[PDB]
Design an enzyme around this catalytic site. Structure first.
Site, PDB file in Angstrom:
ATOM      1  N   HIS A 197       1.506   3.472  -3.543  1.00 52.79           N
ATOM      2  CA  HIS A 197       0.888   4.794  -3.424  1.00 52.79           C
ATOM      3  C   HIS A 197       1.730   6.004  -3.794  1.00 52.79           C
ATOM      4  O   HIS A 197       1.346   7.151  -3.558  1.00 52.79           O
ATOM      5  CB  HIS A 197       0.273   4.958  -2.037  1.00 52.79           C
ATOM      6  N   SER A 234       4.740  -4.112 -13.808  1.00 54.22           N
ATOM      7  CA  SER A 234       5.596  -4.003 -12.640  1.00 54.22           C
ATOM      8  C   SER A 234       7.077  -3.883 -12.936  1.00 54.22           C
ATOM      9  O   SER A 234       7.696  -2.899 -12.547  1.00 54.22           O
ATOM     10  CB  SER A 234       5.356  -5.180 -11.711  1.00 54.22           C
ATOM     11  N   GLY A 237      -0.029  -7.951 -14.074  1.00 56.11           N
ATOM     12  CA  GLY A 237       0.798  -7.171 -13.186  1.00 56.11           C
ATOM     13  C   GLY A 237       2.302  -7.270 -13.316  1.00 56.11           C
ATOM     14  O   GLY A 237       2.996  -6.274 -13.094  1.00 56.11           O
ATOM     15  N   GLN A 286       0.823  -1.208   0.000  1.00 54.44           N
ATOM     16  CA  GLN A 286       0.000   0.000   0.000  1.00 54.44           C
ATOM     17  C   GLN A 286       0.863   1.267   0.000  1.00 54.44           C
ATOM     18  O   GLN A 286       0.658   2.195  -0.792  1.00 54.44           O
ATOM     19  CB  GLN A 286      -0.888   0.021   1.221  1.00 54.44           C
ATOM     20  N   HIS A 314      -7.719  -4.562  -1.614  1.00 53.26           N
ATOM     21  CA  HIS A 314      -8.458  -4.403  -0.358  1.00 53.26           C
ATOM     22  C   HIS A 314      -8.847  -5.737   0.340  1.00 53.26           C
ATOM     23  O   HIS A 314      -9.043  -5.777   1.555  1.00 53.26           O
ATOM     24  CB  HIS A 314      -9.690  -3.526  -0.598  1.00 53.26           C
ATOM     25  N   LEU A 325      -5.868  -3.302 -11.240  1.00 55.33           N
ATOM     26  CA  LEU A 325      -5.515  -4.624 -10.754  1.00 55.33           C
ATOM     27  C   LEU A 325      -4.826  -4.620  -9.388  1.00 55.33           C
ATOM     28  O   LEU A 325      -4.637  -5.674  -8.782  1.00 55.33           O
ATOM     29  CB  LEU A 325      -4.626  -5.330 -11.792  1.00 55.33           C
ATOM     30  N   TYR A 326      -4.489  -3.441  -8.879  1.00 50.57           N
ATOM     31  CA  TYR A 326      -3.773  -3.355  -7.605  1.00 50.57           C
ATOM     32  C   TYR A 326      -4.632  -3.019  -6.400  1.00 50.57           C
ATOM     33  O   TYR A 326      -4.122  -2.878  -5.289  1.00 50.57           O
ATOM     34  CB  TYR A 326      -2.621  -2.348  -7.713  1.00 50.57           C
TER      35      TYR A 326
HETATM   36  C1  HEM Z   1      -5.471   0.567   5.395  1.00 56.23           C
HETATM   37  C2  HEM Z   1      -6.855   0.506   4.913  1.00 56.23           C
HETATM   38  C3  HEM Z   1      -7.260   0.963   3.656  1.00 56.23           C
HETATM   39  C4  HEM Z   1      -8.238   1.879   3.436  1.00 56.23           C
HETATM   40  C5  HEM Z   1      -9.075   2.572   4.506  1.00 56.23           C
HETATM   41  C6  HEM Z   1      -8.272   2.112   1.998  1.00 56.23           C
HETATM   42  C7  HEM Z   1      -9.069   3.063   1.385  1.00 56.23           C
HETATM   43  C8  HEM Z   1      -9.012   3.410   0.065  1.00 56.23           C
HETATM   44  C9  HEM Z   1      -9.805   4.451  -0.514  1.00 56.23           C
HETATM   45  C10 HEM Z   1     -10.938   5.185   0.166  1.00 56.23           C
HETATM   46  C11 HEM Z   1      -9.400   4.579  -1.800  1.00 56.23           C
HETATM   47  C12 HEM Z   1     -10.088   5.343  -2.923  1.00 56.23           C
HETATM   48  C13 HEM Z   1     -11.029   4.333  -3.633  1.00 56.23           C
HETATM   49  C14 HEM Z   1     -11.787   4.872  -4.849  1.00 56.23           C
HETATM   50  O1  HEM Z   1     -12.766   5.632  -4.664  1.00 56.23           O
HETATM   51  O2  HEM Z   1     -11.410   4.506  -5.988  1.00 56.23           O
HETATM   52  C15 HEM Z   1      -8.349   3.612  -1.983  1.00 56.23           C
HETATM   53  C16 HEM Z   1      -7.638   3.474  -3.140  1.00 56.23           C
HETATM   54  C17 HEM Z   1      -6.673   2.531  -3.349  1.00 56.23           C
HETATM   55  N1  HEM Z   1      -6.321   1.555  -2.446  1.00 56.23           N
HETATM   56 FE1  HEM Z   1      -6.863   1.396  -0.597  1.00 56.23          FE
HETATM   57  N2  HEM Z   1      -7.322   1.343   1.329  1.00 56.23           N
HETATM   58  C18 HEM Z   1      -6.714   0.620   2.339  1.00 56.23           C
HETATM   59  C19 HEM Z   1      -5.725  -0.315   2.123  1.00 56.23           C
HETATM   60  C20 HEM Z   1      -5.187  -0.629   0.892  1.00 56.23           C
HETATM   61  C21 HEM Z   1      -4.238  -1.698   0.680  1.00 56.23           C
HETATM   62  C22 HEM Z   1      -3.731  -2.675   1.739  1.00 56.23           C
HETATM   63  C23 HEM Z   1      -3.975  -1.725  -0.644  1.00 56.23           C
HETATM   64  C24 HEM Z   1      -3.177  -2.661  -1.292  1.00 56.23           C
HETATM   65  C25 HEM Z   1      -2.170  -2.313  -2.332  1.00 56.23           C
HETATM   66  C26 HEM Z   1      -4.771  -0.664  -1.236  1.00 56.23           C
HETATM   67  C27 HEM Z   1      -4.716  -0.282  -2.564  1.00 56.23           C
HETATM   68  C28 HEM Z   1      -5.413   0.773  -3.116  1.00 56.23           C
HETATM   69  C29 HEM Z   1      -5.174   1.282  -4.437  1.00 56.23           C
HETATM   70  C30 HEM Z   1      -4.197   0.688  -5.438  1.00 56.23           C
HETATM   71  C31 HEM Z   1      -5.934   2.402  -4.574  1.00 56.23           C
HETATM   72  C32 HEM Z   1      -5.904   3.430  -5.709  1.00 56.23           C
HETATM   73  C33 HEM Z   1      -5.343   4.835  -5.336  1.00 56.23           C
HETATM   74  C34 HEM Z   1      -5.475   5.882  -6.471  1.00 56.23           C
HETATM   75  O3  HEM Z   1      -5.737   5.515  -7.646  1.00 56.23           O
HETATM   76  O4  HEM Z   1      -5.315   7.085  -6.188  1.00 56.23           O
HETATM   77  N3  HEM Z   1      -5.529  -0.013  -0.293  1.00 56.23           N
HETATM   78  N4  HEM Z   1      -8.132   2.869  -0.849  1.00 56.23           N
HETATM   79  O1  LIG Z   2       5.505  -6.661  -8.507  1.00 55.73           O
HETATM   80  C1  LIG Z   2       4.499  -5.946  -7.967  1.00 55.73           C
HETATM   81  O2  LIG Z   2       4.473  -4.718  -7.984  1.00 55.73           O
HETATM   82  C2  LIG Z   2       3.433  -6.793  -7.373  1.00 55.73           C
HETATM   83  C3  LIG Z   2       2.671  -7.557  -8.407  1.00 55.73           C
HETATM   84  C4  LIG Z   2       1.342  -7.168  -8.647  1.00 55.73           C
HETATM   85  C5  LIG Z   2       0.603  -7.731  -9.684  1.00 55.73           C
HETATM   86  C6  LIG Z   2       1.184  -8.699 -10.496  1.00 55.73           C
HETATM   87  C7  LIG Z   2       2.495  -9.120 -10.261  1.00 55.73           C
HETATM   88  C8  LIG Z   2       3.242  -8.570  -9.213  1.00 55.73           C
HETATM   89  N1  LIG Z   2       4.582  -8.994  -9.081  1.00 55.73           N
HETATM   90  C9  LIG Z   2       5.203 -10.085  -9.824  1.00 55.73           C
HETATM   91  C10 LIG Z   2       6.268  -9.694 -10.704  1.00 55.73           C
HETATM   92 CL1  LIG Z   2       6.747  -8.041 -10.848  1.00 55.73          CL
HETATM   93  C11 LIG Z   2       6.965 -10.628 -11.493  1.00 55.73           C
HETATM   94  C12 LIG Z   2       6.638 -11.980 -11.420  1.00 55.73           C
HETATM   95  C13 LIG Z   2       5.611 -12.400 -10.574  1.00 55.73           C
HETATM   96  C14 LIG Z   2       4.896 -11.468  -9.788  1.00 55.73           C
HETATM   97 CL2  LIG Z   2       3.533 -12.131  -8.984  1.00 55.73          CL
END
Ligand code: HEM
Ligand SMILES: O=C(O)Cc1ccccc1Nc1c(Cl)cccc1Cl
Ligand code: HEM
Ligand SMILES: *[C@@H]1O[C@H](CO)[C@@H](O[C@@H]2O[C@H](CO)[C@@H](O[C@@H]3O[C@H](CO)[C@@H](O)[C@H](O)[C@H]3NC(C)=O)[C@H](O)[C@H]2NC(C)=O)[C@H](O)[C@H]1NC(C)=O
Ligand SMILES: *[C@@H]1O[C@H](CO)[C@@H](O[C@@H]2O[C@H](CO)[C@@H](O[C@@H]3O[C@H](CO)[C@@H](O)[C@H](O)[C@H]3NC(C)=O)[C@H](O)[C@H]2NC(C)=O)[C@H](O)[C@H]1NC(C)=O
Ligand SMILES: CCCCCCCCO[C@@H]1O[C@H](CO)[C@@H](O)[C@H](O)[C@H]1O
Ligand SMILES: O=C(O)Cc1ccccc1Nc1c(Cl)cccc1Cl
Ligand SMILES: *[C@@H]1O[C@H](CO)[C@@H](O)[C@H](O)[C@H]1NC(C)=O
Ligand SMILES: *[C@@H]1O[C@H](CO)[C@@H](O)[C@H](O)[C@H]1NC(C)=O
Ligand SMILES: *[C@@H]1O[C@H](CO)[C@@H](O)[C@H](O)[C@H]1NC(C)=O
Ligand SMILES: *[C@@H]1O[C@H](CO)[C@@H](O)[C@H](O)[C@H]1NC(C)=O
EC number: 1.14.99.1
Lengths: 552, 552
Positions: free
Chosen positions: B176, B499, B495, B172, B357, B353-354
């Site tokens: 981010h 990546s 991914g 995360q 949640h 794809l990322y």
């Molecule tokens: C710690 C608790 C977490 C909360 C409360 C949370 C909350 C949110 C919220 C509110 C958004 C905006 C969603 C939307 O309207 O599209 C978001 C985006 C996102 N979250 Fe989480 N999230 C959490 C944990 C995580 C985790 C563990 C990941 C795993 C990688 C993750 C990945 C994402 C991604 C990739 C986005 C897109 C951000 C962007 O495009 O600006 N989140 N999340």
């Molecule tokens: O590498 C990341 O940023 C995490 C991630 C997210 C989605 C898909 C693949 C990966 N990593 C990943 C990569 Cl970069 C290469 C071989 C195998 C895996 Cl599973």
């Protein structure tokens, strides 16, 4: 105090200060080892022997016309040569970019800030004892003295190559899309955030500007018809900002991509020709794609004009410039099986080496007239007077000045030359031999070797003292020209790498881009692959006048 | 309508409309020819036969743990492999970038505007008859129905791979920096104008923000000491804008690179660890370079942390994620004799794809406690409560949820999941099989083949009808997991390319950058080449608490 102030590392090795008065050279991948990166490796020694000098190659590239005439007609042989030209060069550029005016060491700020012109050679540290490092005196020679003694022109020296005004103004109009110093920030800063041939000088740097210039029907660019002729729209009608003196009548204030092209009728000539071309291709595209909307027609045209420009610059412009008997070829596919970075970052030194003001004549002769600088500047009535056909015919006939002979800078533009000198010192440039060494050239041992004569050399020697303190910019305009050539070796050796890198570095040359569909099909693709400075004038100027980059 | 609405061109061929009701496919360099680029060329058919499926390769890599043990200890052998994984992948990415949310055809606007997330597949035309082109109904199934029937979690499903919270929060925190949707513009727009690992989430996107965060002495980042512990400075002391609810006390409003990392103590945990590391390395650098100033120490540190980040992400993070028995290696040199573009453009699909949640648990258990989402959000008192050592120990022990099993999205975060669905439709995404085909995967023939079970498949089949209308995002969270894996084949296959492209695509991996001098010498270079999540958390958190990305 900077222990690296002495430019210790040789052969592209990086100097890093290891302690308050000690340094270290990173010789990684340089081909040499040793405290200073001077002990060559075995394989390096072999490549050093079989390496012909730039002047040797230039000689072969410009002689044996009968031979080149054969190669030139053997598709596979001709490709083989160009591919080597395109690659042998490129390895001299750092890509991704490294330093800039503020950073002599690699940093993220340097690499990520697009507002800076990049740098082939790190600037001289601010705490260095002399302007060029450790050699010379606390101060370089008076720039005004340098200006007057070996740069100002007494008698007009024509270019032995035949370069005319269609060439001089083409180079000016063209180079001015990527050379747009941001004077509000400083000389090492640019406003051309595209860092290349994005044709923003036609379409505008900003979307805001682009939309003000667009007709929004058939993907066309707004324009006006004066006396049955098509010219750019006015600033009063488009609202796009242009630089015009306060006395210019609104109906004469033309609005083009580059805000500064209204200050020279020669720049506005090409501006009109390229505007005419954009909409011309727009008609061609609508013809083939009746289902296409305004945005897609406009966008595809711009992609085609970018391709035409890269085509002409490499097969017409450079073709003439180089003097090669070998026929240059614009074919992005030659790099497809090669290691090449499809990216670019305009260099400050490239910008410095491009101040080709010696090119300009003492008067601009269009038809019967002979205009002085005073009369020519910001005067578009002249253009509206004679018309594009007359300008093309007149400028194709007028020879332009030599650049490397020495003393040929028009006095009407001496401020520009003085500043070139000053700003280069301001940006802490390194000596001419530092840049020569950097570009695989042998440093000049005397001012006489640099100029090839005795008078200017004496003059320079009395000003600088050390040849190793000689400045790049002046040195370029005073360098001994190649036989009947307009430029010296340094000019061609520094400019070619920077040039092809940005020409071939363009995205449209990448594999995912180089194909018919990107240009609306085989019809659009053909427009590009058949472009010529002649067909560029023929299709848009009335009477399809004959044109060329040299005084026929 | 479009005539290209139905995605006729197969194998990456380009569809270009050739008349109101006709289309054509540019099969250039695809390997196939034919009205739809489906007819393979000879060499193509040979290569096909000799190409093992993604699931075959996967299997080999996660088995024969004895073989892998040998290879893994044969320097050159290991190198051989990793180079293959590096290269084999990269060819699936378009670089320079092509389309975006607004352009389904290559345009300069698309290629030059850095404000857009790029796109692996052109959006569906606006004048298409159905949301996914021509198949399905005028409207996709209710996102709320999709959300509730197969996405919402009834019972917490742990990850068979052992992924803990150090992993979930790491992903995360890290993702981010380049996933920063500019919601003021739209989902297809980003604020991370660096399009990669530039560590702006620590240092700030703007120079203005960066200077507000900097101490300006020894290249260090401003910080505060609370109860003998180092934490980020406050918003009241730095003036940098952060997003905090109105009820947060000024002394708790921490100021970090990313304005949103104050909303989750897990994010702020890593933020502090990486701040601690920046200054840690600053001390190391000043030790070696007493002659260095504040700016050069800070800049070099940032270059080192970027390298450490790329090292850890490839040898710890991905290593755990992949489940490979083959030991991944971060060595930019493996690409030096390869054709590779040192550049990147964050993809919208990668961002989609990322959204991992399902990873989050039902309560965050730090020490004796068990915090609900309501209590965990924007609560840095918790962090100040237990301390970094307690957080590292606790989060290293807590298992995180599975992502691809189906029905495992925490209900406390259902809005986020609904939107992922909506926004994806908003950006006119193409169907899951379109993206599968695009990434060299075989399209799913039934919802049962997609899920690997019968219930959710029945649910989806009743909602979508056609498997060829199935949406990407949901499909990823519902896909049949690989054996005891956290992800499905589509997730790993899409991914991985996006990546490595952005990891290896970073400038510091380019030849001119990959050398000691760039990192202040062999001491700085070593910091990078010996980095790991253990040593990260070991040189920065009191007691050197053992840590890992999986539950021990
Ligand atoms: C710690 C608790 C977490 C909360 C409360 C949370 C909350 C949110 C919220 C509110 C958004 C905006 C969603 C939307 O309207 O599209 C978001 C985006 C996102 N979250 Fe989480 N999230 C959490 C944990 C995580 C985790 C563990 C990941 C795993 C990688 C993750 C990945 C994402 C991604 C990739 C986005 C897109 C951000 C962007 O495009 O600006 N989140 N999340
Ligand atoms: O590498 C990341 O940023 C995490 C991630 C997210 C989605 C898909 C693949 C990966 N990593 C990943 C990569 Cl970069 C290469 C071989 C195998 C895996 Cl599973
Ligand atoms: C028609 C006559 C011309 C006039 C009136 C003119 C005038 C000027 C002026 C006033 C500047 C600013 C210089 C400074 O402060 O550093 C300039 C810059 C420049 N000129 Fe010219 N010039 C002319 C022709 C040319 C030509 C034909 C070329 C060569 C191809 C040329 C190349 C340059 C370059 C490269 C710059 C810097 C561009 C930038 O960074 O903005 N000029 N010129
Ligand atoms: C690329 O590098 C440029 C050169 O450093 C940056 O331009 C400079 O940005 C600074 C920070 O925004 C400006 O600093 C001034 O500092 C005072 C005191 O803090 C402030 O009050 C001012 O608002 C601020 N700006 C101005 C105009 O005074 C520099 O002035 C500014 N210009 C120069 C020539 O240095 C670019 O910001 C940077 N580009 C990016 C994308 O980061
Ligand atoms: C990358 O693409 C973005 C999306 O197209 C551009 O952002 C848009 O720029 C437009 C032009 O500046 C803005 O249009 C508005 O149009 C009205 C009518 O002419 C003007 O009065 C407004 O001032 C102008 N801007 C606003 C905020 O009203 C768009 O609003 C703006 N945003 C979006 C989401 O489209 C980026 O400019 C472009 N980036 C670059 C570097 O060119
Ligand atoms: C105890 C967990 C039960 C999960 C099954 C949920 C089936 C769909 O139930 C949904 O749950 C959401 C979460 O509160 C509610 O907001 C929705 O209104 C409700 O329809
Ligand atoms: O190509 C340009 O942009 C003009 C230019 C300016 C300075 C130096 C070289 C060139 N062109 C040039 C090129 Cl691109 C290749 C070989 C020889 C020459 Cl002189
Ligand atoms: C490089 O040459 C030798 C060391 O081999 C030494 O005399 C010299 O000072 C070094 N650097 C310079 C700039 O001379
Ligand atoms: C501008 O051009 C017109 C028409 O060619 C000419 O008559 C006039 O004198 C010129 N103005 C200046 C200031 O040179
Ligand atoms: C491709 O298959 C054939 C042409 O080979 C034709 O029937 C079909 O319309 C083409 N396109 C699609 C989307 O099927
Ligand atoms: C925030 O954390 C503190 C200390 O861990 C806890 O006592 C408090 O209840 C939390 N506040 C909220 C609103 O959850």
């Amino acid at each position: 105090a900077n222990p690296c102030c002495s430019n210790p590392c040789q052969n592209r090795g990086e100097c890093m200060s290891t302690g308050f008065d000690q340094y270290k050279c990173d010789c990684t991948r340089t081909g040499f080892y040793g405290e200073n990166c001077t002990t060559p490796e075995f394989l390096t020694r072999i490549k050093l022997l079989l390496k012909p000098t730039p002047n040797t190659v230039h000689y072969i590239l410009t002689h044996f016309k009968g031979v080149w005439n054969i190669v030139n007609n053997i598709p596979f042989l001709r490709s083989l040569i160009m591919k080597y030209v395109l690659t042998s060069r490129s390895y001299l550029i750092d890509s991704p970019p490294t330093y800039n005016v503020h950073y002599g060491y690699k940093s993220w700020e340097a690499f990520s800030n697009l507002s800076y012109y990049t740098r082939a050679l790190p600037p001289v540290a601010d705490d260095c004892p002399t302007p060029m490092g450790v050699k010379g005196n606390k101060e370089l020679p008076d720039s005004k003295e340098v200006l007057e003694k070996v740069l100002l022109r007494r008698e007009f020296i024509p270019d032995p190559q035949g370069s005319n005004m269609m060439f001089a103004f083409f180079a000016q109009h063209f180079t001015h899309q990527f050379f747009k110093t941001d004077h509000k920030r400083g000389p090492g800063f640019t406003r051309g955030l595209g860092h290349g041939v994005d044709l923003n000088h036609i379409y505008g740097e900003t979307l805001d500007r682009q939309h003000k210039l667009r007709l929004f029907k058939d993907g066309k660019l707004k324009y006006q018809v004066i006396g049955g002729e098509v010219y750019p729209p006015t600033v009063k009608d488009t609202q796009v900002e242009m630089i015009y003196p306060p006395h210019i009548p609104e109906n004469l204030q033309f609005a083009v991509g580059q805000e500064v092209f209204g200050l020279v009728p020669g720049l506005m000539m090409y501006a009109t020709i390229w505007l005419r071309e954009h909409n011309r291709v727009c008609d061609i595209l609508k013809q083939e794609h009746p289902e296409w909307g305004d945005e897609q027609l406009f966008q595809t045209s711009r992609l085609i004009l970018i391709g035409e420009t890269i085509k002409i610059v490499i097969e017409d412009y450079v073709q003439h410039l180089s003097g090669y008997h070998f026929k240059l070829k614009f074919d992005p596919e030659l790099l497809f099986n090669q290691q090449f970075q499809y990216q670019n970052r305009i260099a400050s030194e490239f910008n410095t080496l491009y101040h080709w003001h010696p090119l300009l004549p003492d008067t601009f002769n269009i038809e019967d007239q002979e205009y002085s600088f005073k009369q020519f500047l910001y005067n578009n009535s002249i253009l509206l007077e004679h018309g594009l056909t007359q300008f093309v015919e007149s400028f194709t006939r007028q020879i332009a000045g030599r650049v490397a002979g020495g003393r040929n800078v028009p006095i009407a533009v001496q401020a520009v030359a003085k500043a070139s000198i000053d700003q280069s010192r301001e940006m802490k440039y390194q000596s001419l031999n530092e840049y020569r060494k950097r570009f695989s050239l042998k440093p000049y041992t005397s001012f006489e070797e640099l100029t090839g004569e005795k008078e200017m050399a004496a003059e320079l020697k009395a000003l600088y003292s050390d040849i190793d303190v000689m400045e790049l910019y002046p040195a370029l305009l005073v360098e001994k020209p190649r036989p009947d050539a307009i430029f010296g070796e340094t000019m061609v050796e520094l400019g070619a790498p920077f040039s092809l890198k940005g020409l071939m570095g363009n995205p449209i040359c990448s594999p995912q881009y180089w194909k018919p569909s990107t240009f609306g099909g085989e019809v659009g693709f053909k427009i590009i692959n058949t472009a010529s400075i002649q067909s560029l004038i023929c299709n848009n100027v009335k009477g399809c006048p004959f044109t060329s980059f040299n005084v026929q």
